[PDB]
Design a protein around this motif. Structure first.
Motif, mmCIF file in Angstrom:
data_model
loop_
_atom_site.group_PDB
_atom_site.id
_atom_site.type_symbol
_atom_site.label_atom_id
_atom_site.label_comp_id
_atom_site.label_asym_id
_atom_site.label_seq_id
_atom_site.Cartn_x
_atom_site.Cartn_y
_atom_site.Cartn_z
ATOM 1 N N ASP A 102 -62.611 -17.135 23.294
ATOM 2 C CA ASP A 102 -63.357 -16.833 22.196
ATOM 3 C C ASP A 102 -62.737 -16.371 20.920
ATOM 4 O O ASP A 102 -62.741 -16.154 19.891
ATOM 5 N N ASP A 103 -61.528 -17.090 21.187
ATOM 6 C CA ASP A 103 -60.913 -16.949 20.047
ATOM 7 C C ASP A 103 -60.905 -18.800 19.302
ATOM 8 O O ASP A 103 -59.712 -19.077 18.044
ATOM 9 N N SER A 104 -61.192 -19.780 19.675
ATOM 10 C CA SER A 104 -60.972 -20.969 19.272
ATOM 11 C C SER A 104 -62.186 -20.820 17.951
ATOM 12 O O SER A 104 -63.091 -20.962 18.346
ATOM 13 N N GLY A 105 -61.614 -21.372 17.134
ATOM 14 C CA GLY A 105 -62.353 -21.725 15.682
ATOM 15 C C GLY A 105 -61.720 -22.138 14.571
ATOM 16 O O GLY A 105 -60.682 -21.906 14.508
ATOM 17 N N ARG A 106 -62.349 -21.548 13.592
ATOM 18 C CA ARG A 106 -61.358 -22.016 11.601
ATOM 19 C C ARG A 106 -60.883 -20.457 11.644
ATOM 20 O O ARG A 106 -61.699 -19.575 11.105
ATOM 21 N N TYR A 107 -59.157 -20.974 10.949
ATOM 22 C CA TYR A 107 -59.087 -20.100 10.718
ATOM 23 C C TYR A 107 -58.623 -19.770 9.015
ATOM 24 O O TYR A 107 -58.178 -21.064 8.791
ATOM 25 N N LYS A 108 -58.128 -19.226 8.378
ATOM 26 C CA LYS A 108 -57.127 -19.325 7.297
ATOM 27 C C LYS A 108 -56.413 -18.066 7.320
ATOM 28 O O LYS A 108 -56.154 -17.264 6.761
ATOM 29 N N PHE B 210 -48.859 -23.328 2.194
ATOM 30 C CA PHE B 210 -48.451 -24.329 2.755
ATOM 31 C C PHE B 210 -48.297 -23.577 4.946
ATOM 32 O O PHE B 210 -47.206 -22.424 4.852
ATOM 33 N N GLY B 211 -48.986 -23.916 5.220
ATOM 34 C CA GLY B 211 -48.526 -23.071 7.290
ATOM 35 C C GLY B 211 -49.365 -25.282 8.260
ATOM 36 O O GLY B 211 -49.584 -25.539 7.513
ATOM 37 N N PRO B 212 -49.408 -25.049 9.296
ATOM 38 C CA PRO B 212 -49.260 -25.401 10.260
ATOM 39 C C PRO B 212 -51.057 -26.293 10.569
ATOM 40 O O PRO B 212 -51.976 -25.796 10.054
ATOM 41 N N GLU B 213 -51.577 -27.619 10.327
ATOM 42 C CA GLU B 213 -52.868 -28.052 10.395
ATOM 43 C C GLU B 213 -53.302 -27.610 11.961
ATOM 44 O O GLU B 213 -54.504 -26.124 11.597
ATOM 45 N N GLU B 214 -53.372 -27.715 12.674
ATOM 46 C CA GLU B 214 -54.064 -27.247 14.216
ATOM 47 C C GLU B 214 -52.859 -26.322 14.863
ATOM 48 O O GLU B 214 -51.949 -27.404 15.121
ATOM 49 N N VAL C 100 -56.543 -22.800 8.517
ATOM 50 C CA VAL C 100 -55.960 -22.903 9.773
ATOM 51 C C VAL C 100 -57.010 -23.098 10.796
ATOM 52 O O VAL C 100 -58.024 -22.950 10.891
ATOM 53 N N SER C 101 -56.601 -24.441 11.625
ATOM 54 C CA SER C 101 -57.734 -24.230 12.873
ATOM 55 C C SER C 101 -56.608 -23.812 14.242
ATOM 56 O O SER C 101 -56.039 -24.550 13.709
ATOM 57 N N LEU C 102 -57.694 -23.684 15.269
ATOM 58 C CA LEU C 102 -57.013 -23.175 16.250
ATOM 59 C C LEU C 102 -58.556 -23.513 17.676
ATOM 60 O O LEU C 102 -59.690 -22.985 17.105
ATOM 61 N N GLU C 103 -58.272 -24.168 18.482
ATOM 62 C CA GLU C 103 -58.549 -24.402 20.131
ATOM 63 C C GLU C 103 -57.948 -23.485 20.843
ATOM 64 O O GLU C 103 -56.338 -24.497 20.813
#
Lengths: 118, 227, 227, 225
Positions: A84-90, A4-8, A104-107
């Protein structure tokens, strides 16, 4: 699913960020791998930081990862963000191939301004 | 007159609970009345040392200084001192040893690579590389084990720690074993064991035979009844 | 008053192509009146050796003179001597040096091993192990090459030669290249070069990539049923 | 009465490690009392030759000066001179040789190609091509070594450097080897060694094997009911 963690999470460049992901406090999850991986349109997480020590070559000095088995948590700190770090992560544990993980999503966006009139 | 101070391995302790600590001097002169005293950091001496060395055949003369302590004392990490007092240089040399403090715990990740198919074509000997990785502190112990009989160490050779290029703290090591290819062609798996003080029950191990390691052949024959 | 002369080594000479011989002293004083003279068998010229040592923190002096020369001649077996004329003693002090013929020769055979599936399972960082074998004499050398340009000697680590247990003192060694598997998943043939005087061309390479342990054939047998 | 001098060729120096250049004086008439020498940039004294061949079939005189040197000397960009003071020539003939410094530096890229099946269908002899290209200057030397043992030049052939057609001035070369099928499916490492001056270690090599490919293949058996 049991992770469990933060979505975006959003921030802008030059700043730090700190992400927390949760796992059930059992014995193995207190004593086994945690990871932060990045996927794409190519089919696979590439590992970026690990709880075993390895840090990606592109993330040396940038970030690290710590585990608090007492909180049933592990924490990921990222500093010096860029666009360059914005993308989809886990976040996740154990072998990357399975999914004992959480997406996790990162923008990341540039720091605006330059307008003394506003 | 050169002295080796020999601290027991964590492995030696944990398989003996008998934390003898010794110091050897090598290629000195074996007179008689060779005297070395074990003392703590306090200066206070400790239990004596028996079964001490004698004159070597090749003049590389020696003297073993035996000692003992309580394990928690070494865990406490205080300096220990055996000092040589022999007439060769009646000046008392100082051998002070301790346990480092601040080292974190980290586990061996024992992979086990099988012999390269090329070496199987020189048609006599096969080599297997037990590996340990990314672990702290130093001084892992390993041996090799197969068919429930131990393998006397003259078959295998082991590295010592030396830091990772990438990991700032974690050391690694190796082990190598040489065996006739037909013996490895026989099937006849092999198990390399490691003991190290970040490992849960202190001891993990892995195995490989011809079939596990890099097989060209995958033969599943799975049956699924009563859907 | 003791003087050593450093002998060139295959590691050194190969890293320089320019075999050079120099000399070092113990327990002398750091002034002028320093006579570094390198000699042929009967004592021919020394090159203009420059960049000499400086006064050492204990005021010992070591006089260093390099003589870059041709390469086969040391292999040819020409005894060389290091003569000095200091202020502390007037008597000439000469140190013979040469290529030590004697012990026999044994070629190596590098076997390269590709990273364990398990490690790639973690898909964490791939380590490739280059394992030189059963050769003589010592002073092997290795460096890692891919696409023809090399990698910094920090990206890998080889401990210097160990004796081999089973055979007599034919030696072995090993270095390990560790790389991002996220790259070893891509190709990047990553070969490991070996230098050894006993080698009929002095330099051998082998290499491997992912498609080097890949199993040839699957043999699936699915018998889904409801009986 | 014509002076030639063969420079030490990288292929020759490799097989020898005994760098050697020889000055051949052609169509000289069979006099004697002939002084033939080898001299450095300062005319320095060399060791003499040995074993002059017999007099020419056309009854002329061949003067050859065989001198052994250090390999660096020729690659150090330093000239050599071989002098002849013949009866007919009232003066010594000092001719200067220098390596063609300024030529480009192009290492090869050996692609040892494997033999397709068609020839491995008459079951007679496989044929292995050690294609070399993308390199200059010329004088690449290629030979095949086997599992720690050399192959004498019978078992293989190679061309001479032929310039690349479309790529600018440079070169390639061929080489070939033949072995019977019951070898190339038996073991038979078959590495092909390339000696050329622009390699970092100055020597590369590659190898292939019966199984240098033959990718993943499936015997999927799927019985259902």
């Amino acid at each position: 699913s049991p992770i469990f963690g933060p979505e975006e999470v959003n921030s802008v460049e030059g700043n730090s960020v700190s992400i927390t992901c949760y796992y059930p406090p059992t014995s193995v999850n207190r004593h086994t791998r945690k990871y932060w991986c990045r996927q794409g349109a190519r089919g696979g997480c590439i590992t970026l930081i690990s709880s075993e020590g390895y840090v990606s070559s592109k993330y040396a000095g940038r970030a690290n990862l710590t585990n608090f088995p007492e909180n049933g948590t592990f924490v990921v700190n990222i500093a010096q963000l860029s666009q360059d770090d914005s993308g989809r992560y886990k976040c996740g544990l154990g072998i990357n191939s399975r999914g004992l993980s959480f997406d996790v999503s990162l923008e990341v966006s540039q720091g605006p301004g330059l307008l003394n009139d506003t | 007159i050169r002295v080796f101070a020999i601290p027991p391995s964590f492995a030696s302790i944990f398989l003996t609970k008998s934390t003898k600590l010794t110091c050897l001097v090598t290629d000195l002169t074996t007179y008689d009345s060779v005297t070395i005293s074990w003392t703590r950091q306090n200066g206070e001496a400790v239990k004596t040392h028996t079964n001490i060395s004698e004159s070597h055949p090749n003049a590389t003369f020696s003297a073993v200084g035996e000692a003992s302590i309580c394990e928690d004392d070494w865990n406490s990490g205080e300096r220990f001192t055996c000092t040589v007092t022999h007439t060769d240089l009646p000046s008392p040399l100082k051998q002070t040893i301790s346990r480092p403090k601040g080292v974190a715990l980290h586990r061996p990740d024992v992979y086990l690579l099988p012999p390269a198919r090329e070496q199987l074509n020189l048609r006599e000997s096969a080599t297997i590389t037990c590996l340990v990785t990314g672990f702290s502190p130093a001084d892992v112990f390993v041996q090799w084990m197969q068919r429930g009989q131990p393998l006397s160490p003259e078959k295998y050779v082991t590295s010592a720690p030396m830091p990772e290029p990438q990991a700032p703290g974690r050391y690694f090591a190796h082990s190598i074993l040489t065996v006739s290819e037909e013996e490895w062609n026989t099937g006849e798996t092999y198990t390399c064991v490691v003991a190290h003080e970040a490992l849960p029950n202190r001891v993990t191990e892995r195995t490989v035979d011809k079939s596990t390691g890099k097989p060209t052949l995958y033969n599943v024959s799975l049956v699924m009844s009563d859907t």
